Structures are given as C-alpha cells and as structure tokens.
Amino acid sequence: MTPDIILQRTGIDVRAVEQGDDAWHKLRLGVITASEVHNVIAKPRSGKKWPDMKMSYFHTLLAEVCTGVAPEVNAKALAWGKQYENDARTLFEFTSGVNVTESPIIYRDESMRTACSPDGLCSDGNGLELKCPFTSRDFMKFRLGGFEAIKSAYMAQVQYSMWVTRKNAWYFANYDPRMKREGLHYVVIERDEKYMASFDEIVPEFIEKMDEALAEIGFVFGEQWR
Amino acid sequence: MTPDIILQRTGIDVRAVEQGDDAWHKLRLGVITASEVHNVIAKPRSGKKWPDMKMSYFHTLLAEVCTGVAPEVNAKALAWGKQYENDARTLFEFTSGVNVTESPIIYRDESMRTACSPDGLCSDGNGLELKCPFTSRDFMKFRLGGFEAIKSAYMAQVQYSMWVTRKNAWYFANYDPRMKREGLHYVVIERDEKYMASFDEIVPEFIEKMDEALAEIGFVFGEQWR
Amino acid sequence: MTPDIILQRTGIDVRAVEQGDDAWHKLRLGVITASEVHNVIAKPRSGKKWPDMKMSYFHTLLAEVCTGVAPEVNAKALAWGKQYENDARTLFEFTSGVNVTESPIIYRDESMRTACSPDGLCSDGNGLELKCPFTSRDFMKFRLGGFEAIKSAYMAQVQYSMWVTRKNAWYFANYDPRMKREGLHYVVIERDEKYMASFDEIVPEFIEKMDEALAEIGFVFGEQWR
DNA sequence: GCGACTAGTCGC
DNA sequence: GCGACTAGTCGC
Ligand SMILES: [Ca+2]
Ligand SMILES: [Ca+2]
Ligand SMILES: [Ca+2]
Ligand SMILES: [Cl-]
Ligand SMILES: [Cl-]
C-alpha cells in the first residue's frame, strides 16, 4: 500500500488525518477493523451457525457500504478513553523508553477490506495498543492478572493488528489517571499463530459472504467511497 | 366495538387521537398489546411455571392499572421514527401500492383487554407494520434475510394484530432513508392459525390471572381510566 | 468499636454525616457493604475459580483503595430514592407504628473492613431497609409475591445488615408514590444463622485476599483515608 | 424444575 | 469501554 493508492480509491488524503475526524471515519467504512474483529472470529458452542453478534457485525458493515454512513456513537467511557489517550502515550514512552510514532490507519492488502488503527508504531518495531479504562475496576483487573486477564476482544484486536501489519509483537498498555500510584502497566504480546491461522481461514470467508450478500441486493464494495 | 363504547369506558374520544398523544398512551394502559405479546406466549423449557419475561410483563401491566402511569418511550428511537414516519408511509403507498388509512388503536372485543395500534390499515384489507429502524444494521438484516430473518417478537406481534383485528394478511415493512437506494423493503405475512390458537388459550388465562392479582390488592381492571 | 475509633483513622466526625454527603462516601471506600455483599458470597458452579461478579467486586474495592474515589453508579434509581426518602419513611412509621432513627453507617468491628448503611433503625430494635423501586413493576413483584419474591441480592444485603449490627430482625419495605393506594408493603426478615456462618467462613478470607492483592502492588488498606 | 452463575448482546 | 439485560448452562 501507499498513501497514494488510498487516494485513488477513496479520494481522501491520509497524511493529513487525525484518529477521530471525519476522514478517519470514512476510511473505515465497510472495512474489517481490529476493534471489531472479535465479532468475526466469534464461534457457536455447537453447529456452524454464526452467532448473533457475528451476524450483527456482518449486517453492520453491509449497511456501512450501502448507506455510506456510520451512526455516531458517544458514550461516557469511550470519551474518557479518548480524553486520556495522549497522557497514556507520553507516560508509556517515558517508562518504556521507546519513541512512539502515531499511525493513521493501515490496511493489510490492495483489497482494502481489512485494517487496523494502531495507537502507535514504536522505535523498536513493536506496535502499541493503549487502553484508558473507564472503570478503575478494570484497570485493577489488568494491573494484577496481567497477560492472563486481557479481554479476549482485546487480544483479537492486538493479534489482528499483527496479522495486518505483519508485525511480531505489540505493546498493550493500560492507564488510569485516578491511580495514586501504579497508574501505568503494560505487557508485550507476541504474535500468536493460532490467531494468524484463524484469521487466514475466517476473514476471507467473511469477506466472500459480504460480497455475495451485496450482489444479491445490487451493491458493490467501494460504494461507500464514491 | 365502536367510538361510543370507548367513550363510555375511558371518557376518551378516539377520533381526537394520533399515534403518540397523551390519550394514545392512556388507552393502552393495562392492555395486552401487540408489541408486547411475545412475553405473554413465552413458555418454559419444561413444565408450566411462567418464564421471567412473562411475570415481568404481568407485573408491568398490573402496575399500569394501579398507578395509571405509562412506560418511558425511548425518545431517541421515536424522534427518529416520527421524523420519517410520513416519508415511509408515502413511499410504501407509491410502491406496493395501496391506500393507507390511519388506525389509532383497535380493541379485539368489549372487554378492552387486548388491542393493537397498527401503523395503518390498507385498502386491500391488509394491516400494515411500517418501521423506520434506528439502525441500518436492522434494515439490512431484513432486506437480505426476508422474514425468516426477523423476530421471535415481530412474528408474534404481527399475528397478534391479525388476531385482534380478525384480518387475514399483514404487510411487514422497513424503511431506511440512509440507504442510497432501495431503502424500502416489505413482505406480506399470512394469518397463521397455530398462532391464532395459541392466543385463544394463553391470553384468556393471562387475563384471569391479572384479575386474581388485582382483586388480591383490591383493584379492578378499568380503574386506570377514571 | 466507637464513634472516635473512626476519627483516628479517617479524620471524620460521624455527627455531621447525612447519607449522601461528601463524608458519607469517603467512609465507604474499600469497605465491604451490604448492597454489594452478594458478590462476596458467590461460589462457582464447579471448581474454585471465583465467579466473575466476585472477582469484579474484588477489583472494584481495590480500586477504591488505590484511587480513593468510587464512580457514580445508577444515579437514576438513587436520585429517585432520595426524593421519596422522607415520605416512604413517614408512611412506614404511620403504618407500622414504630419510630425510625436514621443511622449514617455501621462498621462490624474496629477492623473497619465491613459495614452497612441502614435506611433506619427502629424503636422496636429492628433495622430498616426501605426501598423506592425505580419501576412500579418491581413494586408490584414484591406486593404480590412477598418474602419469596425478593431476590438473592436483597436477602444477602439484609442478612449482612444483621451480621454487621448483631440484630435479630430487619424490616424489608418498598414504597411507590405512583400507586393510587397500597403504595407500601413490608415484611420482617429474621436473622438466618446459615447466612451468619457463610459470612463467617467467607468474608474473612475475602478480606485476607484483598490484603495480599494490595501488597502485591505496594498499597495498604487504610490508605484511601488521608 | 429451580436458581445461581456465565456468556453473550447491543445500546449509549 | 462500559453496563443493564437476558438467554443459556449446570449441580442439585
Ligand atoms: Ca486504544
Ligand atoms: Ca409501530
Ligand atoms: Ca440502604
Ligand atoms: Cl459508560
Ligand atoms: Cl463480631
């Protein structure tokens, strides 16, 4: 990929874009993102039937393609994550001693069907995921249990981000500015090939199924971007 | 069953009412309605103890009788629906096509225990459920899957409205204006006699049980219209 | 275990303290409270692995300890309960013919790890849990269903209140201002010695684990009061 | 069946 | 990033 090829497809220039703004949102329309991918790998306890949460994501992205919008979602907890992200980053850099470079959005391949938005790329070649949990209760869960107690959704997110960027390891850092002390804690998550194999199998399928579904109703992927 | 009988029981004039008046809500108080009947017909896995969803609608309805006060409208979904209500109506008229005349509320019999408030009545004898889903996701679920796609709750709602109104078929419509094109989808649902029978045995019991409960606390159905 | 034992640790005059004010909340940080205690007595279906809720409540208190804050929970229900506080109480004394004294907070022992904040203390020596349920539906559930319909989380709360205050009986009441009549219902729950033991086996272990956890990260219980 | 736990589900 | 519901599972 290049910031050039993205222009052809979407008319948008990516070099002058901020995590959050208008153009950022449009870039993600219809695209399987690391933040939502837990839904794509969700399995039924029996059968081969896609569970509701996976169907709902399926129809969510299809709507994104056919309407060219996404619904605006504000929640207290998300706004908090956004408010404290910058401070988490700086604290993280000071403590780990690495430099972080902010990354717009990264697609896996020419198809542009798969992407992550890293919280940064580090000077040592690892990617970075920051959490600023809205509840101090969740911060504590991670501060004590470490790797053990990363939410599966967060794992799929990190793993997918390696899957997309081809990277080998990823920082996962949790920050709480209400902690008197010990308000930063991070681990390194190694690329895991069970996940990689899972995405190789499951993601191409999910994309095929979305193609078949849009054809039935006379749309084509990419319409969100005209 | 007529505007006279309703005036005599509730002192309300039905012709003065639109979908959403302070009177629209008053007329529904304590009445088993279409949109809520799925709770009425919920069965346990085994046995005959009423499931939680059924108790919880039971106590909801009883509370309406004894307080005379109504459930909070989710303002967000309704402001949406009210805003495109008319466009959907006209589009479906133009489309199907048929003439859609408004129905405020329809009770099944003089007991006034059972009612629907259809989104209209149609010239060719069909009723009409016409929704503008708050999420395009839901529009897509239905647009692609047809009716097998949708509810436990929607089928029950529609059949119930045929039960109440004696009618033989119903249009189930969705309108999404955010759709770039073909944002109206619809099916015709035929009166299913196995549902009709289900209502005929389950709903009366349910009503006997509310009358038992009201007497236990010295209330009488109808008090909510004083 | 006296009024002054408190001032030495916290610097708080328990006189001034009116349920809701600044001082009230400070006194509850990191302390196992009756409303939450059902999370503490939870047991997993199979192994030993403390259930979600238990772990969740575990982490909530630790964070109270290390942040010295607790976020606002509910608010909706709580603001409703505030508004009807006096009337529920007046109606209750009228009806039961006992007099209600408001207690701010009550610790079980000088360890100060365990507390309840009863809605009152009665002239007959019983305590008083006095709820104004957010929905009339829940009022109705308790009105028709009595003792047996009130949940596990409520019984636990009440029993813990006896466990804390060393009392043999407790009034469990609901008030609903919206009910035309019959707006107040109440029962008497007696001390249950199996609950007492359950609290005796389980609680001190749960406290012992909190202390292990806090050490782990260089925090000490007591710290939040500074 | 019962009922406390457990795992989604989806709104905000 | 929750958080209020609720459909499901499992040991009596
Ligand atoms: Ca992040
Ligand atoms: Ca409707
Ligand atoms: Ca209380
Ligand atoms: Cl939130
Ligand atoms: Cl003691």
Side-chain angles (χ1 to χ4, degrees):
Chain A
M1 283 281 87
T2 58
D4 178 41
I5 304 172
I6 284 140
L7 174 83
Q8 278 161 41
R9 312 286 226 90
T10 80
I12 298 140
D13 187 289
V14 73
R15 303 166 218 256
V17 150
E18 261 249 304
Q19 249 200 316
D21 50 305
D22 272 6
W24 188 84
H25 277 282
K26 195 188 264 190
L27 276 167
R28 288 163 62 87
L29 291 174
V31 174
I32 295 160
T33 67
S35 53
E36 302 297 331
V37 80
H38 64 278
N39 293 301
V40 184
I41 65 180
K43 262 140 186 199
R45 62 318 317 261
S46 165
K48 61 196 281 300
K49 189 172 168 283
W50 291 9
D52 284 0
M53 269 190 83
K54 184 186 181 168
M55 274 306 286
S56 299
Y57 188 52
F58 188 61
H59 299 136
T60 299
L61 280 190
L62 302 160
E64 282 185 13
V65 171
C66 301
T67 66
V69 297
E72 165 225 24
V73 178
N74 34 74
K76 215 43 177 150
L78 283 189
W80 180 268
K82 281 167 151 309
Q83 193 197 315
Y84 292 102
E85 171 197 303
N86 276 348
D87 282 337
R89 197 185 341 279
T90 65
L91 189 33
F92 162 86
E93 267 178 287
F94 184 80
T95 310
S96 59
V98 296
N99 207 78
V100 175
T101 295
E102 272 183 278
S103 181
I105 179 197
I106 294 156
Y107 297 89
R108 197 174 135 91
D109 58 46
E110 212 210 0
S111 94
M112 289 192 55
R113 295 310 287 276
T114 46
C116 59
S117 295
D119 300 335
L121 305 182
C122 313
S123 47
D124 65 357
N126 289 355
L128 165 65
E129 182 47 31
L130 297 148
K131 280 334 175 199
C132 304
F134 181 62
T135 67
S136 301
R137 168 204 77 203
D138 284 339
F139 182 81
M140 265 299 319
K141 183 169 178 67
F142 175 63
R143 187 71 191 65
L144 300 182
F147 179 81
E148 241 313 300
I150 303 173
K151 319 174 177 187
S152 65
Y154 282 180
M155 191 50 86
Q157 180 176 16
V158 173
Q159 286 308 321
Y160 190 79
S161 301
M162 286 179 300
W163 189 69
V164 174
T165 54
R166 282 144 182 94
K167 277 147 134 75
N168 278 314
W170 215 257
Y171 289 103
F172 181 80
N174 257 212
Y175 178 51
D176 190 338
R178 296 159 296 207
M179 290 293 285
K180 274 281 135 272
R181 291 188 313 281
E182 309 295 326
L184 182 91
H185 185 64
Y186 63 87
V187 300
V188 170
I189 294 165
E190 299 303 315
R191 184 187 186 83
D192 169 355
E193 299 280 341
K194 311 263 89 178
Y195 275 92
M196 301 303 99
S198 217
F199 299 139
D200 284 331
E201 186 199 68
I202 295 156
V203 166
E205 222 156 82
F206 191 81
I207 285 164
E208 272 188 286
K209 299 287 155 196
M210 285 184 280
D211 282 336
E212 297 166 17
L214 308 147
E216 293 174 24
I217 68 180
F219 291 75
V220 68
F221 183 88
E223 283 194 63
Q224 64 278 25
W225 294 323
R226 314 273 140 73
Chain B
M1 204 52 259
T2 141
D4 215 312
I5 290 78
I6 294 147
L7 179 77
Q8 157 208 133
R9 312 260 272 111
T10 74
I12 290 173
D13 173 23
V14 265
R15 285 170 285 243
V17 312
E18 287 167 45
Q19 230 204 14
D21 308 20
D22 275 39
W24 192 79
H25 298 285
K26 194 134 162 287
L27 289 159
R28 295 166 55 94
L29 288 174
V31 179
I32 297 156
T33 61
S35 56
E36 294 296 317
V37 73
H38 53 282
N39 306 303
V40 182
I41 65 179
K43 278 197 171 334
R45 303 210 38 72
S46 168
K48 69 175 192 197
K49 197 205 178 169
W50 290 9
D52 277 355
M53 286 307 232
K54 178 160 187 196
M55 298 304 286
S56 176
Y57 179 56
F58 185 61
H59 294 149
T60 290
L61 220 49
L62 291 166
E64 289 183 4
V65 176
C66 308
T67 70
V69 281
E72 214 48 335
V73 301
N74 190 60
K76 182 174 183 179
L78 254 85
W80 178 261
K82 147 104 163 152
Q83 235 200 39
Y84 288 100
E85 185 164 87
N86 319 253
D87 299 318
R89 193 146 48 233
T90 87
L91 200 62
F92 168 84
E93 269 171 340
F94 169 113
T95 310
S96 36
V98 300
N99 196 88
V100 168
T101 37
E102 245 111 324
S103 217
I105 185 162
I106 305 171
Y107 301 94
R108 162 164 164 106
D109 57 35
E110 307 238 341
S111 85
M112 283 171 83
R113 303 309 294 260
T114 59
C116 60
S117 294
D119 298 302
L121 291 170
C122 309
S123 258
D124 67 301
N126 289 339
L128 161 79
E129 194 37 41
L130 177 52
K131 295 151 191 300
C132 308
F134 184 70
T135 77
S136 298
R137 170 204 78 217
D138 286 342
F139 175 74
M140 277 287 332
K141 188 201 194 210
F142 179 51
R143 179 66 192 82
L144 281 182
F147 201 80
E148 279 308 308
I150 58 173
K151 250 71 157 168
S152 73
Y154 297 151
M155 181 57 108
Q157 171 173 18
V158 168
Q159 289 299 319
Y160 190 69
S161 308
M162 279 171 309
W163 195 62
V164 165
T165 56
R166 277 72 173 203
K167 301 175 115 60
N168 287 258
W170 218 260
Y171 296 102
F172 190 105
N174 275 201
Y175 167 67
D176 181 7
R178 296 161 285 201
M179 276 295 294
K180 279 306 165 169
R181 73 210 168 242
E182 311 163 47
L184 185 94
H185 180 68
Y186 80 47
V187 291
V188 175
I189 292 171
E190 304 279 339
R191 167 163 196 126
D192 174 353
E193 285 294 325
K194 213 154 307 154
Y195 273 94
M196 302 304 102
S198 225
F199 299 138
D200 288 332
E201 62 146 11
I202 289 178
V203 172
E205 271 167 36
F206 196 81
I207 295 160
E208 268 138 40
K209 280 275 187 300
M210 296 178 87
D211 290 330
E212 279 187 40
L214 291 177
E216 278 184 15
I217 65 180
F219 275 83
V220 61
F221 177 93
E223 262 184 85
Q224 75 274 34
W225 296 317
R226 307 294 159 76
Chain C
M1 178 53 227
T2 92
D4 202 46
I5 279 104
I6 288 150
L7 183 61
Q8 294 172 32
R9 286 195 177 92
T10 77
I12 305 166
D13 163 89
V14 77
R15 309 285 96 166
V17 173
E18 311 297 324
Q19 211 211 51
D21 65 12
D22 268 26
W24 192 75
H25 291 292
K26 223 102 195 332
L27 287 173
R28 295 173 55 94
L29 301 164
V31 185
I32 313 185
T33 64
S35 52
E36 300 303 321
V37 90
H38 67 279
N39 292 307
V40 182
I41 51 159
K43 314 181 197 185
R45 289 212 290 267
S46 293
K48 63 173 106 102
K49 195 221 163 213
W50 288 13
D52 274 348
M53 71 179 128
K54 191 169 168 173
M55 284 300 313
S56 174
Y57 184 47
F58 190 69
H59 296 146
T60 300
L61 291 179
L62 310 169
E64 281 175 353
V65 164
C66 316
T67 69
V69 301
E72 177 175 285
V73 41
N74 273 305
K76 213 182 175 31
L78 229 7
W80 179 259
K82 191 76 189 78
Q83 185 190 351
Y84 290 108
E85 210 159 60
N86 294 345
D87 296 0
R89 196 159 61 236
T90 305
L91 191 54
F92 170 82
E93 296 177 306
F94 177 77
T95 307
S96 61
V98 306
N99 280 110
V100 175
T101 314
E102 294 183 75
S103 182
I105 172 149
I106 305 182
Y107 300 94
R108 159 145 167 113
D109 61 36
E110 30 189 34
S111 108
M112 203 149 168
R113 292 310 285 266
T114 59
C116 67
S117 284
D119 299 325
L121 301 178
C122 306
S123 66
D124 70 4
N126 296 334
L128 170 61
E129 183 55 23
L130 189 25
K131 286 175 196 273
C132 303
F134 194 67
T135 67
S136 298
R137 180 204 67 206
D138 292 338
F139 179 87
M140 264 313 308
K141 190 178 189 167
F142 174 58
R143 181 60 195 78
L144 299 179
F147 198 129
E148 277 287 312
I150 38 145
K151 74 173 86 149
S152 104
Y154 292 147
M155 180 61 75
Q157 163 171 29
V158 159
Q159 287 303 332
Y160 189 79
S161 294
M162 279 176 284
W163 192 69
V164 179
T165 54
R166 295 148 179 87
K167 299 167 112 61
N168 297 292
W170 210 265
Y171 282 106
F172 185 85
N174 281 199
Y175 171 65
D176 194 355
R178 295 157 285 201
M179 286 287 291
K180 299 318 181 157
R181 28 168 221 289
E182 307 323 310
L184 173 99
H185 189 65
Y186 71 73
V187 296
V188 172
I189 323 297
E190 301 260 283
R191 210 176 163 92
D192 180 345
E193 290 294 331
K194 284 176 182 147
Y195 271 81
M196 308 295 123
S198 239
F199 295 140
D200 283 344
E201 186 57 34
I202 296 180
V203 167
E205 259 142 7
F206 178 96
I207 276 153
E208 181 186 302
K209 296 306 194 214
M210 281 171 57
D211 273 338
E212 298 184 350
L214 302 165
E216 194 94 76
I217 55 144
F219 281 85
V220 57
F221 182 87
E223 210 164 328
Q224 64 277 30
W225 309 308
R226 187 64 83 265

